[PDB]
Write a protein that binds this ligand. Structure first.
Ligand SMILES: [K+]
Ligand SMILES: [Mg+2]
Ligand SMILES: [Mg+2]
Ligand SMILES: [Mg+2]
Ligand SMILES: [Mg+2]
Lengths: 49, 49, 136, 136, 136
């Protein structure tokens, strides 16, 4: 949304004027982050952890 | 002006993408009606005549 | 590469078979089916002619500095050729974003083998078997 | 190739290891262990001698026009040799449905490497690492 | 090959990616990341210089006669070099337990492509793509 602005001074019985909410967008473009590891079954058995 | 869809066409909503994908060229499927269909037990075989 | 079907243009599926799909950074803007080589550390750019510059084909369109996927060797691929290719022709990059035959280039060995022949500017089906780099 | 156990004859399995098992059309009658090249569009025939003609080895016996499974590069194969092979020898098609050494052939580069040595007419264990086609 | 994190030296993980991991027997005592070739039937020893002697790299330390896991072509590997390598350099065995460039060697074709450059004595990241046996 646009910033808050200020109402306008007006005569009596006069037309109210427009300064409605104006809009824009912020983009996102997510990047894939990856991590991998491999362990042999014999390592998995033998390790203390 | 005011607020109309031509201004905020990517800002306040997305253009619809239809959930239905319309077909390419479809070729005429007939063989199952246009022939006798044999559900074989084996890749190679012979039919008695 | 692209495929006309009446009023429609479709993207060509670069990858026929294989799992040699590896991550790099684009050194320039790259397009799907484009041959590439290493221009920096895990950074890939469009190949030039006459060999010594091939790692794989770019799988999808990317801008400079974006993460790219490549099909490397033991992938079967759909690629665009600058000349007529028959089956069993060895091919390598032409420097134009396309492939040419070893027979046409100044190089003596290729990087892919044509399985399905194509005319100039059309899609051949080829198998990637080698990479080529700097030998001096 | 075949094996005798008393009165019984058993087929040798061509594929030791590997997963580059790819589909083609036979352009002639082909036998298990037979080296082949692209004779046409996804169509394979038995390799001649002296290189420029190799895609894989035929995994099972086929008639002309039938679909064939080839072991390509990345595959360890049981294949028949016309001469004595020692380990580390590069081998390529013989032109006789068998393999010969790069040393014996007019070619300078092979398609498979011998892992288990074998005598003339026997079965070696070899690893396919390269394909060969038309370079002019 | 080894990595420094403060006072600590760590064993480098030879394998970055790939599944071309194959069993041989050690013909001698071998160290991790060492280039190797076939010295006998399913038996591998450390490569000499100038080509014709490469099957893969040794994945962990073995004594003579012990079963070796070898990374072949289709593997991304962390390997030690004897000279400065840039990305896109072709490398082959040095004879010293290391890799050198094709440019430096008396050979004219390599076995791996450098993906990340390194100085003399440092660890490059490479993709193995070829095997070299004897051609006579
Ligand atoms: K390969
Ligand atoms: Mg008014
Ligand atoms: Mg305002
Ligand atoms: Mg019958
Ligand atoms: Mg891979």
């Amino acid at each position: 949304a646009s910033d808050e602005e200020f109402a306008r001074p007006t005569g009596q019985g006069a037309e109210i004027r427009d300064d409605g909410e104006t809009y824009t967008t912020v983009a996102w473009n997510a990047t894939k982050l990856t991590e991998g590891s491999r362990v042999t079954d014999e390592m998995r058995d033998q390790a203390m952890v | 002006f005011a607020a109309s869809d031509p201004e905020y066409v990517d800002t306040l909503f997305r253009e619809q993408l239809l959930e239905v994908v319309m077909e390419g060229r479809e070729l005429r499927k007939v063989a199952r009606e246009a022939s006798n269909v044999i559900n074989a037990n084996t890749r190679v075989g012979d039919v008695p005549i | 590469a692209t495929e006309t079907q009446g009023e429609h243009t479709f993207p060509v599926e670069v990858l026929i078979s294989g799992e040699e799909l590896r991550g790099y950074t684009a050194g320039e803007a790259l397009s799907a089916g484009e041959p590439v080589y290493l221009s920096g550390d895990y950074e890939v750019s469009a190949s030039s002619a006459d060999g010594g510059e091939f790692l794989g084909v770019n799988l999808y369109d990317v801008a400079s500095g974006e993460p790219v996927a490549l099909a490397g060797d033991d992938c079967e691929v759909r690629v665009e050729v600058s000349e007529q290719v028959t089956a069993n022709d060895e091919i390598l990059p032409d420097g134009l974003g396309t492939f040419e035959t070893v027979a046409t280039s100044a190089a003596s060995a290729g990087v892919a083998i044509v399985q399905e022949g194509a005319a100039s500017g059309e899609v051949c089906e080829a198998y990637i078997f080698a990479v080529q780099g700097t030998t001096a």
